[PDB]
Amino acid sequence: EDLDTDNDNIPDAYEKNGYTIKDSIAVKWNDSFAEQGYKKYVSSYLESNTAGDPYTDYQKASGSIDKAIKLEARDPLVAAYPVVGVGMENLIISTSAYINANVRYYNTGTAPMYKVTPTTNLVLDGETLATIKAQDNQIGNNLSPNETYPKKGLSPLALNTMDNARLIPINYDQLKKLDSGKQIKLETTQVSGNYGTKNSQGQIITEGNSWSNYISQIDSVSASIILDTGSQTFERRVAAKEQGNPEDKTPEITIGEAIKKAFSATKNGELLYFNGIPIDESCVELIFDDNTSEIIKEQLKYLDDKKIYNVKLERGMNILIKVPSYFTNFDEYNNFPASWSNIDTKNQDGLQSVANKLSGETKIIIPMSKLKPYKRYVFSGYSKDPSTSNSITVNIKSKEQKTDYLVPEKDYTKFSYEFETTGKDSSDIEITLTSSGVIFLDNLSITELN
Amino acid sequence: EDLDTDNDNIPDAYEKNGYTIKDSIAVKWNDSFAEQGYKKYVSSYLESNTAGDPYTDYQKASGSIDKAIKLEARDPLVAAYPVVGVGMENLIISTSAYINANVRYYNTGTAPMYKVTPTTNLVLDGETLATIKAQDNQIGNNLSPNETYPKKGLSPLALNTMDNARLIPINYDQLKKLDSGKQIKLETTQVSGNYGTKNSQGQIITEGNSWSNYISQIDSVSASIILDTGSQTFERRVAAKEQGNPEDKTPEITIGEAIKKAFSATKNGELLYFNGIPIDESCVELIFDDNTSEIIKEQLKYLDDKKIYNVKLERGMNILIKVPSYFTNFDEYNNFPASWSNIDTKNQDGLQSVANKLSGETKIIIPMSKLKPYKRYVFSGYSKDPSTSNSITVNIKSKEQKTDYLVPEKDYTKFSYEFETTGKDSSDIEITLTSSGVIFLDNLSITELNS
Amino acid sequence: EDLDTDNDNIPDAYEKNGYTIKDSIAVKWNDSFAEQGYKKYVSSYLESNTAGDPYTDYQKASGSIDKAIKLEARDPLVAAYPVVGVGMENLIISTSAYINANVRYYNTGTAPMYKVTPTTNLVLDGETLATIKAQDNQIGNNLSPNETYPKKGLSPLALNTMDNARLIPINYDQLKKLDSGKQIKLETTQVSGNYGTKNSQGQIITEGNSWSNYISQIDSVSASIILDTGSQTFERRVAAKEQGNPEDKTPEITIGEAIKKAFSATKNGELLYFNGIPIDESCVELIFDDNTSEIIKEQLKYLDDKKIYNVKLERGMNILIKVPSYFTNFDEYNNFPASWSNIDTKNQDGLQSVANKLSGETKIIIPMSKLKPYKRYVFSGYSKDPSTSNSITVNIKSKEQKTDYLVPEKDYTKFSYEFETTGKDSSDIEITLTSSGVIFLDNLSITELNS
Ligand SMILES: [Ca+2]
Ligand SMILES: [Ca+2]
Ligand SMILES: [Ca+2]
Ligand SMILES: [Ca+2]
Ligand SMILES: [Ca+2]
Ligand SMILES: [Ca+2]
Ligand SMILES: [Ca+2]
Ligand SMILES: [Ca+2]
Ligand SMILES: [Ca+2]
């Protein structure tokens, strides 16, 4: 049919099922289109803006938007949210005295933000010295995704202008507090910026637009997903449907499918490869808040697969993905600087290819040269014991020595232990675990925490 | 036919193949038109703006844009991107202390910028003293490509005021470093300016137009190309198709074709000349970043020709062309002040006409008067040895004495040697190379590099 | 026919050949329209702005533009171009110290310029003190061509505001340099102003119409021509076609035709008089830049007439003309206070009517009262010698005595000798030339040069 209820040039019959854009016209999706590299899109048949962003479904699917917006946002289910922050580099105190800092804007979203006017807070400890908003001297004309202002290869801009006047901490009690060695933290509160929309004459106009009009809408119709790759962080929002409203037609997608859509991850049959780094559920650590934790726990009892990535995405969910710094699977990736002890690769019952046949105990000596001091670390792994009759205890050396006992189940079970390392010139980290009999180990990961 | 999906007054069939403009209407391209000056255009038939610049395909092809835009930007695949920078000419500081500087704006793109307003950072050593924005006294009304404000013959303008205010370091601790052999630098973070457009009434309006809209769009679709000839620097961006997009119809062009389109260089059969200076691969030293270098390395092994200029241009590639300061080919150009030793021109196995027949060793005493001190240089040339039984070692005098060995291949191979010369009142540079037997040399050059 | 590609109310055929405007409609030009006082217009048939100026071909040809725009701009080839500078009449230093100047704006173009807001630079010796933009006090409401602001008969306006605050030498070093007798100068980097167009109702609006839009476009579609008559200077820009572009249908005219079109000089057969004073090739010297010099020198060898005025115009050429101050032709003009020596007017082989029959040597005693000190002067003349066997040497008294030899050819040859005279209370300038036999001399000129 050709019925268009929401008037966005895409018939509702195509929007309900899969659809793709070919020569600027929507066509019914076919299973043979994946060979050329095409993609399958779904969206609600009642709304012109499924994800809430200022671009419609046809504009996002056909790529009729600003060319600096990532292809991760061309899917109508992924909002074109620019997540702009402020990073502080250096602090200068001189003569009361005056305070200025060298800052540099950061963007981690999926869209550009013209005319960036960040508002930041100068907090020392709880007390906020003075709120500052960028003047005409500290406005970023362009800020592309995954790029900074000033861009790489340029010194950070100075932030001294106040009100105009200077930033004067007249109260010398703050100076006395700084004498003890306190540091001043710069937190960002709000950021103002534009999008790029084409006028009737074909030019791009960015004056009447404002991202501040679509922040509330995008926040309240989407679920936040954050990916951490050790150095580069990505923040994305994925649209989700309401539970009590029968008139909300937003498509339902699993957490893994949502991750693949948002981060443009390549799926080689079963695994999810982001940039060659495997971000599969077993190969990465996931952190949820309390609400998402209870939602996932409730939904897991009705799932036969008992896999996190198979749970349906829901509005208001929060997900944070942290890629471990060191991860070994004994098959194709082993970045641990020090070789493990009592390891056997002759196995066929592993998670993907093989497992580790341990007979006795495993002890690893990790040098601290490749560690981050004053940082919490969590050790995770998967243990499989069909016997279910061997007790495993773990000894970990840290600021406080940890000794815990583990009871492996018949199938693979994930064990997580938390510890903290303090001081660069401290004792070397010692980790030791013992097994009563023969156990299987796979996917040992080391993850940095806060 | 007569079908234009993109609605830019050019049919899809004409855009898929070659097309040219004849009297305000697009016509099917023919090979006989090239002798009359007509050139063939290709573009994408799904987007009006192929390169992302404000002007459509028809406006660029038919030349219906502002006449100050270079003809090299009439090609739909070349973006009219104005690269405007600020150069510092003098520093005047006096008493705390006040800082006064004389600056001059520089343009290198293919389109003029109206109402220039750069933002500058006054970095001393990593630390940024203050960020300045140009007020109404430092706003350039017009800036044509390859032109400066103030123009040539006019003294540079003075930038010494903040937002009807004064500029001052808030303390003398900066002056302490300034005395201790530190130089305050200047780098432009951003430039704001309008672009020329036409209205219904016919006048050119540059009031509501802004370049900031079309910078993130142009930089995300086009691959940067930079040409440096020692005196003048040209910066260009050439649109390239996305690799993973099946719906992207942007045409694919080679690196050499991209350079020819961007710089409008003359191509007489095989050689490429910019303005009489050859920019052929064997006559210049190309500098690539990591990604472009590895990309070219990957596609090189799959090509029988194995030539850099024959690789297809791709999005995000960065290419820099450094025209050598001294270039000799033993055929028609030898700018070396001192002639070479033990050179025989009686040969027929050269790259273009002849090669160098060396029997023994070659030592060149390069005068220092024509060399820039405190700079790094790279010595490059082409060597051919069918025997593959003679080893070549080089002895070059510099700040650190260099002694390296080379193993010539059967065919012509290009090499590079890196050394640093420091101090105006230093020893003369000595270059010596020895060949075990008879070797063939061609296209010897000296190229300046970053210090 | 009735075909209009560019849609400017004139058919393509009429623009290709000559055309003229009779009763506000374009008609085919005829050879019998000259006697009525009409003129023959030619313009490109692919552009609605042949010269690129804000006005179209029909508006310029029919005279539907401001009456303040001179008649020389009614030719579609010659564009209107306000060339506005700033001249200084008084320099005042008072007390740090305060600096104020009295300035008058000058217009030497072919169009008015409303709302003049010039930007000026203060330089004492190379270094720029500050940059000044005109405030609401110094803005000129109107500036007609060849007029000033304030008008003739009024004292110059004041310029003392740096931004409103007084100007300031920021250091005592400025007074150090003033103690050394250093002169502060004034140069204009740019100028802002409006142009007038009749709106859709019938009123002239100059609010949103800026001249800065049509500066870069006009500079790149025209060649610069300057005429100086000793005291008053006029600048014009004449449109020229591109070289390699086949779609550029801009008509081609010679240097003499371009001068006649730009300055509206009268043609009485062959002679050219600007306003009664000769400006023909033999009656003035043309001062060129480099590129013009090589282009014209290359083009002369392929042309039989071998005259500068017969060279085809081209884009980018810069021409400067300095009408002679002391000039004699022995026919109708001799402004030298002292009569020449050994002069015979009984001849018929002169450039126009008669020549000089010199038998021996000619010496002239020129008083220096009418000579400007600290200025460079050039003596020019035409020599004819069918014998081609006599050597002529010239003795000129100046700061450094000059003695050079000249070898006359069979035909008339132009010779130029350059010298500088310094000091009002200096020795009198002596000019002497000796000829071996009988020589023919005509069009001897003396003209000021750069300081
Ligand atoms: Ca629909
Ligand atoms: Ca829809
Ligand atoms: Ca495994
Ligand atoms: Ca088309
Ligand atoms: Ca097109
Ligand atoms: Ca050769
Ligand atoms: Ca016409
Ligand atoms: Ca016309
Ligand atoms: Ca005569």
What one-character-per-residue DSSP string does C309-332 give? GGSBP-TT-EEEEE--SEEE-SSS
| Chain C: closest CA distance from residue B137 (Å) | 6
How far lies A450's CA from each of A318, A378, C199, in Å?
Answer: 18, 10, 67
Enumerate residues 6+ apart whose C-beta is below 8 A from C228: C320, C321, C322, C323
Q: In angstroms, rounded to a whole number, what is the distance separating the alpha carbons of residues A255 and A244?
A: 20
B141, B162, B275: best mutation site toward chain C, by most C Cβ within 10 Å? B141
Cβ proximity of C354 and C405 under 8 Å: no
Q: In angstroms, rounded to a whole number, what is the distance separating the alpha carbons of residues C57 and C14?
A: 12
Give yes or no for B96 touching C (CB within 8 A): no
Q: In angstroms, rounded to a whole number, what is the distance separating the alpha carbons of residues A336 and A379?
A: 13
State whether B163 and A102 contact (CB < 8 Å). no
The reply to whether omega before C82 is within 30° of 0 (cis) is no
Cβ proximity of B262 and B81 under 8 Å: no
Angular region, A407: left φ>0, alpha ψ -120 to 50, beta rest: beta
Q: Which residues of B touch A74 (CB under 8 A)?
A: none
Cβ proximity of C262 and C236 under 8 Å: yes
- Please state whether beta strands B271-273 and B197-198 pair in parallel, antiparallel, or not at all (unpaired): unpaired
Q: In angstroms, rounded to a whole number, what is the distance separating the alpha carbons of residues C111 and C83?
A: 9
Residues making up chain C, counted from first to last = 451
Query: Ligand 2 (ion): which residues have CB within 5 A?
Result: A 6, 8, 15, 43, 57
State whether B163 and A94 contact (CB < 8 Å). no
State the Rg of chain A over Cα. 26
- Is B66 labelled as part of a ligand binding site? no
- Is C354 labelled as part of a ligand binding site? yes
Give buried/exposed letters for A92-122 (b at 16+ CB in 10 A, else e).
beeeebbbbbbbbbbbbbbbbbbbbbbebeb
- Is C53 labelled as part of a ligand binding site? no
A141, A147, A194, A207: best mutation site toward chain B, by most B Cβ within 10 Å? A141
Q: How far apart are the first and last CA of chain C?
A: 57
Residues making up chain B, counted from first to last = 451
The reply to whether omega before C118 is within 30° of 0 (cis) is no
- The amino acid that residue A32 corresponds to is S
Give buried/exposed letters for C363-383 (b at 16+ CB in 10 A, else e).
ebebeeeebeeeebbbbbbbb
Cβ proximity of C287 and C378 under 8 Å: no
Q: Beta-strand (E) ranges in B34-139? A: 84-94, 98-107, 113-123, 128-133
Find the C40 Cα to ligand 7 centroid distance in Å.
Answer: 15
| Nearest Cα residue in chain A from B52 | A67
| Residue with tokens 């008083």, as numbered in its chain | C367
Q: What is the DSSP string of C149-181?
A: ESPTTSPPEEE-B----B----STHHHHHHHTT
- Please state whether beta strands C318-322 and C222-228 pair in parallel, antiparallel, or not at all (unpaired): parallel
- Is B247 labelled as part of a ligand binding site? no
Give yes or no for A157 touching B (CB within 8 A): yes
Chain C partners (3+ C-beta pairs within 8 A): B
Q: In angstroms, rounded to a whole number, what is the distance separating the alpha carbons of residues A98 and A93?
A: 6
Give yes or no for C147 touching B (CB within 8 A): no
Cβ neighbour number for residue A176 with a 10 Å cutoff: 10
Task: Report the run of H or E that residue B118 belongs to, with start and end.
Answer: strand B113-123
Torsion of CA C208, C211, C212, C215, to 10 degrees: 150
Q: In angstroms, rounded to a whole number, what is the distance separating the alpha carbons of residues A364 and A334?
A: 14
Q: In angstroms, rounded to a whole number, what is the distance separating the alpha carbons of residues B26 and B18?
A: 10
Give yes or no for C187 touching B (CB within 8 A): yes
Enumerate residues 6+ apart whose C-beta is below 8 A from C296: C288, C308, C311
Cβ neighbour number for residue A401 with a 10 Å cutoff: 10
Find the angle CA(B193)-CA(B197)-CA(B201) to the nearest 5 degrees: 135
Q: In angstroms, rounded to a whole number, what is the distance separating the alpha carbons of residues B336 and B325?
A: 9
Structure tokens at A273: 């490869």
Q: Which residues pair with C90 in a beta bridge?
A: C102
Find the A345 Cα to ligand 3 centroid distance in Å.
Answer: 9
| Nearest Cα residue in chain B from A103 | B128
> Chain-centre distance of CA A193, in angstroms?
22
Find the A58 Cα to ligand 2 centroid distance in Å.
Answer: 8
Q: Which residues of A touch B216 (CB under 8 A)?
A: 66-68, 112, 114, 142, 144, 196
Q: Which of C171, C177, C164 is nearest to C137 (CA)?
A: C164
State whether A155 and B126 contact (CB < 8 Å). yes
How far lies B103's CA from each of A156, B151, C127, in Å?
Answer: 21, 12, 11
Give yes or no for A30 touching B (CB within 8 A): no
SS3 B322: strand
- Is C353 labelled as part of a ligand binding site? yes
Q: Which residues pair with B273 in a beta bridge?
A: B266, B278
Give yes or no for A158 touching B (CB within 8 A): yes
State whether A66 and B129 contact (CB < 8 Å). no
Technique used by the depositors: cryo-EM
Sign of the torsion angle spanned by Cα atoms A306, A307, A312, A318: positive
DSSP letter (8 states) at residue A438:
E
| Residue with tokens 């030719």, as numbered in its chain | C75
Cβ proximity of A426 and A349 under 8 Å: no
SS3 C68: coil
SS3 A246: coil
Cβ proximity of B73 and B110 under 8 Å: yes
Q: In angstroms, rounded to a whole number, what is the distance separating the alpha carbons of residues B281 and A40?
A: 44
* Structure resolution, Å: 3.6
Binding-site annotation: residue ranges of A for Ca(2+): 4, 6, 8, 10, 12, 15, 44, 47, 57, 329, 331, 352-354, 442
